[PDB]
Design a protein around this ligand. Structure first.
Ligand SMILES: [Zn+2]
Lengths: 69, 48, 167
């Protein structure tokens, strides 16, 4: 098994930890829109930052003529 | 002097083991970040 | 403020509704047209029961910017000459058809292409770009409010044909 990780899965060249001196995966859907989707696993962080910025900006924010008559 | 063309006049010299170690460090960091993020927003093209 | 309104009503009983055809081709002509439109509205108001009553409020609202332009002498002269010709043939006793004909000169005009036509066929040529209607179009396509009052002049024409039919 890997020398520095201590897990049994991979090889010493494959260990994602930094070499020392001594996990959810996209489920395989194969629609071409689904592999090339820019917004995948989207929780809502960007929309919440947008709404919060707009709420702060909004919080900072807050007749007839003679002949017509 | 009239502003026509602008050549970058510099050749990039690197030490070879130092450059190998720099690419290995950023290889490991990009793997760790792809694992760590659930949602990776690849940017849209063309940018402008 | 009610003083100017009262003196203007006193001047409003003074000026008369007479369209002379030599006088068409400036401020007094606009006032005479303004007052003839008001008199048509008053002859509706005398007989509101027999018609459609549901069109009268909307007609007054759609006409009110036109009446404002005629009160302030701000109407464009090419358009006003056509409108005064409509209103002359409306004022005359029997030629109710020449009113609608000059109205068709008012609304569409003499433009070759009233509404633009774009991308007729598969084969594209440069001269097709002359066809389209942003440059020169009908008066009924200038603005959406102008559509309302030009339509309302036609509605007063139909009112007047009914009134000279019966009363
Ligand atoms: Zn390992």
């Amino acid at each position: 098994f890997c020398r520095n990780c201590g897990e049994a899965g991979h090889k010493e060249k494959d260990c994602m930890e930094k070499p020392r001196k001594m996990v959810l995966v996209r489920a395989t859907d194969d629609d071409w829109d689904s592999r090339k989707d820019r917004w995948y696993g989207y929780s809502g962080k960007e929309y919440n930052e947008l709404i919060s910025k707009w709420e702060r900006d909004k919080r900072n924010k807050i007749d007839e003529e003679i002949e017509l008559m | 002097t009239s502003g026509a063309i602008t050549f970058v006049n510099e050749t990039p010299r690197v030490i070879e083991p130092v450059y190998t170690a720099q690419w290995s460090a950023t290889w490991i960091a990009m793997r760790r970040e792809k694992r760590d993020r659930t949602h990776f927003k690849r940017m849209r093209f063309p940018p402008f | 403020r009610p003083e100017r309104i009262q003196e203007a009503i006193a001047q409003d009983k003074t000026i008369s509704v007479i369209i002379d055809p030599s006088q068409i081709g400036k401020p007094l002509l606009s006032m005479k047209c303004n007052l003839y439109i008001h008199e048509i509205l008053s002859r509706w108001k005398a007989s509101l029961e027999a018609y459609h009553p549901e069109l009268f409020l909307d007609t007054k609202k759609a006409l009110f910017p036109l009446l404002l332009q005629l009160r302030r002498n701000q109407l464009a002269p090419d358009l006003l000459i056509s409108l005064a010709t409509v209103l002359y043939h409306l004022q005359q006793p029997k030629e109710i058809n020449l009113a609608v004909q000059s109205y068709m000169k008012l609304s569409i005009g003499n433009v070759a292409w009233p509404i633009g036509v774009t991308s007729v066929g598969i084969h594209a040529r440069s001269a097709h770009s002359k066809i389209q209607g942003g440059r020169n179009a009908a008066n009924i396509m200038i603005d959406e409010r102008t559509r309302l009052w030009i339509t309302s002049i036609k509605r007063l024409i139909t009112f007047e044909e009914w009134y000279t039919s019966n009363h």
